[PDB]
Symmetry: C3
Subunit: 284 residues, 3 copies
Amino acid sequence: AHAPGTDQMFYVGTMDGWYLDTKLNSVAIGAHWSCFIVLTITTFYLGYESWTSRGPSKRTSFYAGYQEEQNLALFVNFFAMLSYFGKIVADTLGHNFGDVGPFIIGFGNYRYADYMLTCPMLVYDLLYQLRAPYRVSCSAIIFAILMSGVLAEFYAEGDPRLRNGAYAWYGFGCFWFIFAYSIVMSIVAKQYSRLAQLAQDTGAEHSLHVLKFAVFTFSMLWILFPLVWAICPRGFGWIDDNWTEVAHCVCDIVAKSCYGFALARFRKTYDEELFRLLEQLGHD
Amino acid sequence: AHAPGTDQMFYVGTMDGWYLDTKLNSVAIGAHWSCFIVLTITTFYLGYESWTSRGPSKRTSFYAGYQEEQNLALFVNFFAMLSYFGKIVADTLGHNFGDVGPFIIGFGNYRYADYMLTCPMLVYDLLYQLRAPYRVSCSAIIFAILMSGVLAEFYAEGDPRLRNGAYAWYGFGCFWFIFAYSIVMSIVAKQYSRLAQLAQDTGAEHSLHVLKFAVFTFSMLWILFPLVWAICPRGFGWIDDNWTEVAHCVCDIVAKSCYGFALARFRKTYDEELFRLLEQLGHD
Amino acid sequence: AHAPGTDQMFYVGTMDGWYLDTKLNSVAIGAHWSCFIVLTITTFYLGYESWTSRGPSKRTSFYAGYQEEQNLALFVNFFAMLSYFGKIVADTLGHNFGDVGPFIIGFGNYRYADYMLTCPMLVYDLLYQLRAPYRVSCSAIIFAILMSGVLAEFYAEGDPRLRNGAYAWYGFGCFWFIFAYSIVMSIVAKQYSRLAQLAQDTGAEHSLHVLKFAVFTFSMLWILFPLVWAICPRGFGWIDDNWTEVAHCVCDIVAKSCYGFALARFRKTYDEELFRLLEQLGHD
Ligand SMILES: CCCCCCCC/C=C/CCCCCCCC(=O)OC[C@H](COP(=O)(O)OCCN)OC(=O)CCCCCCC/C=C/CCCCCCCC
Ligand SMILES: CCCCCCCC/C=C/CCCCCCCC(=O)OC[C@H](COP(=O)(O)OCCN)OC(=O)CCCCCCC/C=C/CCCCCCCC
Ligand SMILES: CCCCCCCC/C=C/CCCCCCCC(=O)OC[C@H](COP(=O)(O)OCCN)OC(=O)CCCCCCC/C=C/CCCCCCCC
Ligand SMILES: *C/C=C(C)/C=C/C=C(C)/C=C/C1=C(C)CCCC1(C)C
Ligand SMILES: *C/C=C(C)/C=C/C=C(C)/C=C/C1=C(C)CCCC1(C)C
Ligand SMILES: *C/C=C(C)/C=C/C=C(C)/C=C/C1=C(C)CCCC1(C)C
């Protein structure tokens, strides 16, 4: 695209950049391959869990087929796998894939466009395990934060005259992220405190450790993405574009595959009394 | 973009127009600033209402955290605020923002693309307060009407050879809007008649006035947008592009901030018997 | 759009191709007109059914207004009608409409972008009539399959250097479609077997034939779209672009209008005992 006063052309948001050669090296391609393999393995594992999912009473046959929120995490990983498959295809074809081509929500050709579909599901899935309030609200504010990140990505890669819009959108997203982070931390802490005080001398002591570790760790590790934005060339630039892909791949692996495996480990050890305590949680 | 037979270039739907200088004057920028400030204030007020929201019985602590439909209106305003923040950013950067750049649903860089996310929520939120039937259907038809408006906006700003497509899409949207308008008016009138005949000699006479005023006024004031389309340069052209932004800002302010404040005023005066009458409404 | 090493320009995903003259003949325009007329007639018929919809007991007045899943099929046809109206407009204006212009989900300017909104609703609506499990999962995997088809359409129409990406995306979609097809066939067969063994000596023998024919026929006829992709120029090329539009129009007519008419025929002959058997289906 052309801009007034400059002879340089900008390929962000155009199909002209879609036909350009790739700018990545072997490290980024290897990171994409590793992330795709991990996501595929986790997707198959969660699908096998969903197929052979007896309930907490181990009596219902297709428990996940009727209570489909249990499949929610699986959905995330599945879509994540899709968002990486195209990257692999681009890496095999050798054409440019970063912030170029059509804008589709749920596809990873833009930096935070793929996260729009999966992150609200991640937040709702995490808040459900404690029967926490304000679940759809957190999902909506996370969707807004990701949209702000996408607009910042658009502003950063275009005309240098409009570079300051990226900082404004980043500040907007960071303000609302700090708000949502504080709300989520408070709600999760309160719900876990009530669950711990409801399960005294019950026998669910072993099954509480996995749930606590999962919810606290994978709710605290959501601050890595703003830090990656800060240290990548969008911010200070302490790392280059090739190591930003590796950081993003590691972040997705930790945030999705490990979280799904932790939920799968928790689901095979809890039973009826912990389930009824969880039901009692979301009523007072 | 290039068109056959003409040397002129069209910037609608391209990133070339994103880098162009802004075409607005001080009046439109002031209108955008006023709308953004009003939406931000209303969003904070509704968020404070949602945090400190005791139920109709004034016993449940996080009532809005579990019955999250009460937060629905808040969501609208929040997203509306986002749709104006970018406008402010453009006004601060001085680049063109109208019908240019990427097409994202929920962002206001296109005329009716931001309304796609929030208007169905507005319609469902308004129909819920009377426990009215046909709620998702009205939301879907409003989404279709907004999509028709977006296509008309695409056709109007492009090649003059294709100008008549805007009129066709406007006629499609107006036909379905007249249908939906009649259906909504009939349903709301019937539901309010039943509510009025259910609350004889109950004491909810004062609390009924606010609900009646809110639902009737903010369901009747939805016809302003087609009239603005008719009088703007898309239609007869009695006003210019700079005064169309002011009209749109006033329309959003009235349709969203006043409606949210009216719901907040209604929610703090109704109590258990009006709530159980509302519950009885949506059963026969 | 420009590509390195070639002087040829590619109009896929650009507004430059939106202003080009149409490439269709009278056959494709007639097919579009016929499909639009059929979809409009079916939409009006289903809307009249929804308005005058007494329940299975023939006592509830606005049964479809409160149980709105019954309107789901109607929604599909309505949106399908929208996706064809624009085509008609293009055919009346004479400008190019295939894989050009803005990318909007739910609009038919791209080959499988309109199906994204309606196909998951079709799958959920079909699985609900048997109270089958795994309804949202099938809808999500169908959405992913349609996204893969859209990416294949993008790769096929662009630079010949990137032609092999279309085959990769087609293989991805076909793999997941075979998986989903097998799952849906197994679930539907099991649910219908249980329904048949629950209705012995009941009198619902006549009302079972319509439901069986509808579900089996319109779940089996979903394999036509991959075959059309195989035989069109995207694959072997046994037919041209003008006869691909006719095949797609016939496929939409059969998959949507006939299915909606079959559901309308089934709904006016079943009564309370079949409804309670259907309720008992989705519990064990
Ligand atoms: C502006 C964006 C804001 C986004 C806010 C929301 C973010 C995403 C929220 C995800 C919501 C959860 C999706 C899945 C819900 C599934 C609920 C469910 O199946 O529970 C079971 C429940 C009841 O059980 P029965 O079937 O009766 O079984 C009884 C016999 N044992 O089943 C149902 O009734 C299902 C009815 C449909 C529920 C609504 C599903 C809507 C899904 C929308 C898409 C979800 C992802 C959206 C992502 C948004 C990205 C922009
Ligand atoms: C093609 C587009 C058509 C659009 C049609 C729909 C337009 C938007 C409709 C908005 C639907 C309402 C969204 C919010 C629903 C929230 C429901 C809810 O929370 O009610 C509470 C309810 C039950 O209460 P419990 O949590 O058990 O508490 C018991 C202890 N007291 O909670 C739930 O079960 C929530 C389950 C998830 C509900 C589904 C939410 C899906 C939201 C989808 C996005 C909504 C906006 C979509 C905009 C569309 C723009 C294209
Ligand atoms: C990533 C994409 C994955 C897509 C996965 C989902 C695909 C689409 C699934 C469609 C879900 C069904 C949509 C319609 C649900 C309507 C449910 C309903 O109305 O049931 C009635 C039910 C209960 O009855 P009452 O009103 O109490 O009446 C009592 C007095 N008799 O009413 C409700 O509570 C409605 C609450 C809202 C339900 C949630 C609706 C959300 C709709 C989201 C959009 C649906 C299409 C999405 C298409 C996706 C394309 C990307
Ligand atoms: C699987 C992916 C996950 C959990 C992604 C989470 C992403 C975020 C929390 C992103 C946050 C952002 C901001 C707070 C500011 C603006 C830019 C973002 C998108 C990096
Ligand atoms: C907060 C915004 C609201 C309530 C917007 C409402 C908008 C409409 C009712 C728009 C209607 C249109 C038509 C009926 C015809 C075609 C164009 C539109 C988009 C102006
Ligand atoms: C009303 C429209 C319907 C029911 C459409 C159904 C479409 C499909 C089942 C499409 C499937 C595809 C594949 C399996 C592979 C890749 C390309 C598609 C989109 C043709």
